[PDB]
């Protein structure tokens, strides 16, 4: 019972980009979440063998970490600030999807995803 | 463990 | 119609596939489910099982009466569970790439 490969962090086939808000998530959002408390479960995709969940790769189809977002962040990997945007998202509701709503997963999960909202708001203009 | 729709899974929690 | 085949053959196909699509391969059954007070709530259920049948079977009159019964699927899980639940935000998943779907729906 393995984990499956990590997403991608690089393709020469996606067009890559750079823009303010891109360079906002980078260094101002996903900065204060990886210094979270909270944040250790997430800095790295989910590991089922260590943590004896042989039904997480089986329900999850789509993982994503903060380890993912951060590494496609820094080879400028998505087009626009939405994409990345999603990429935390889909963290977030495979928490939620997984887990119930009250697990300390759920609750760290939450936590850190209130503070992302607020940062979010800040966002800059293209 | 957590049940959506007729299908059961061990969560992180148990 | 060719809109028809392609919600059928592509559309239809590719939500089926998804990895939250099993809730809504198939009508709810809210006795067996133990879900109370679901038909005295959602007056009008909806799922992929009864589109792809109703496409097989020639029943829509045109593209947009196949979505509207999308829509239909996506609105009674909307409607009947509490937002940010986790049924949610598995069909809020499907209306995603439902949706995109759509956009390169083929001219008549």
Known sequence: ?????????????????????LQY???????????????????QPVDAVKLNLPDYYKIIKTPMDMGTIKKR?????????????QDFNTMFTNCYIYNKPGDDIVLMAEALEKLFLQKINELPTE | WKTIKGATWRTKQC
């Open chain 1, 1 to 21: 019972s393995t984990n499956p490969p990590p997403p991608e962090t690089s393709n020469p086939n996606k067009p890559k980009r750079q823009t303010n808000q």
């Open chain 1, 25 to 43: 998530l980078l260094r101002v959002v996903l900065k204060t979440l990886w210094k979270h408390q909270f944040a250790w479960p997430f800095q």
């Open chain 1, 73 to 85: 962040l820094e080879n400028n990997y998505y087009w626009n600030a939405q994409e990345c945007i």
